[PDB]
């Protein structure tokens, strides 16, 4: 009677034990030195890491020579190297377990723009991302949690419409410019 999907899931996992000093300080350093909004983002990214760890664990507990094991291991490796979280020289599944959260956070476009130095003060970089002044390879994207792929790391440039790529200066520019032309002549 309805042509809808209902296909949805939570993108994050809550902490089991609330109010531990150590975890609180850990997430606080991660967010603050990573310029996140709230620790829901930290939970989501750690949840993604946990899911991939779960898949890798299942794959390792599966015997070698399994066509599905080989196929899925290679697929996981290729998608990680395509992401950039994996070095091309480490194609072994156990290495995936040794991976940690912070480098997955590095692949966030909000961090990558600051790393490229295109937008300083990583909080300012993220605010500029929300200000959609960047432009991806063929598009203008406003998503701080955007993950870059290896091919697109070098495809990050300011949007033409922003007063940082092409022209078209902003509305405070227009206002104060007309103000100056109305005050002097």
């Amino acid at each position: 009677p309805v042509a809808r999907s209902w296909v949805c899931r939570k993108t994050y996992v809550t902490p089991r034990r609330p109010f531990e000093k150590s975890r609180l300080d850990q997430e606080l350093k991660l967010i603050g030195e990573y310029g996140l909004r709230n620790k829901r983002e930290v939970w989501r990214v750690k949840f993604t890491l946990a899911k991939i760890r779960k898949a890798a664990r299942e794959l390792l507990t599966l015997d070698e020579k399994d066509p599905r094991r080989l196929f899925e291991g290679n697929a996981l490796l290729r998608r990680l190297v395509r992401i950039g979280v994996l070095d091309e020289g480490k194609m072994k599944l156990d290495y995936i377990l040794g991976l940690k959260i912070e480098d997955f956070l590095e692949r966030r476009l909000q961090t990558q723009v600051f790393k490229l130095g295109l937008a300083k003060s990583i909080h300012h970089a993220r605010v500029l991302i929300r200000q959609r002044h960047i432009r991806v390879r063929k598009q203008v994207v406003n998503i701080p949690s955007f993950i870059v792929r290896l091919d697109s790391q070098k495809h990050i440039d300011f949007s033409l419409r922003s007063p940082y790529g092409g022209g078209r200066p902003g509305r405070v520019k227009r206002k104060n410019a007309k103000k100056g032309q109305g005050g002097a002549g």
């Binding site: 959609r132 063929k138 598009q139 203008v140 994207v141 949007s159 033409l160 419409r161 078209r168």
Partner: protein
């Protein structure tokens, strides 16, 4: 028009529907969404066709402006177009009239003429006095 271009893809020819089907995408870097009429004009001029048998709709823009993609519909004759083409597009650029009462008045009229039986005079008379 100074910097506005049109590109076409997945372009195929056919004759049983006496038309050619392709998907078209339009670039307008610092411009709003492009009205359909001059796209019709551009495709007519670049396809050496009359600017009247081209029908276009479903125009949506990729995020951030510039690229805008949609479906283009070129026939060979507005005659065969009239034969096989949905009416509401002809309603958009007015060639086919479309003006009727809503389905509610239609249905109540239907029930009214259903109430009376047999007699043509009263059946059509169910719309004369009961309007």
């Amino acid at each position: 028009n100074d910097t506005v271009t049109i590109r076409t893809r997945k372009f195929m020819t056919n004759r049983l529907l006496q038309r050619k089907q392709m998907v078209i995408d339009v670039l307008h870097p610092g411009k709003a969404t492009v009205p359909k009429t001059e796209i019709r004009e551009k495709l007519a001029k670049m396809y050496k066709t009359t600017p009247d048998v081209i029908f276009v709709f479903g125009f949506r823009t990729h995020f951030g402006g510039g690229k805008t993609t949609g479906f283009g519909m070129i026939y060979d004759s507005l005659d065969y177009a009239k034969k096989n083409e949905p009416k509401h597009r002809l309603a958009r650029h007015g060639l086919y009239e479309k003006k009727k009462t809503s389905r509610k008045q239609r249905k109540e009229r239907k029930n009214r003429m259903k109430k009376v039986r047999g007699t043509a005079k009263a059946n059509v008379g169910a719309g004369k006095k009961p309007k």
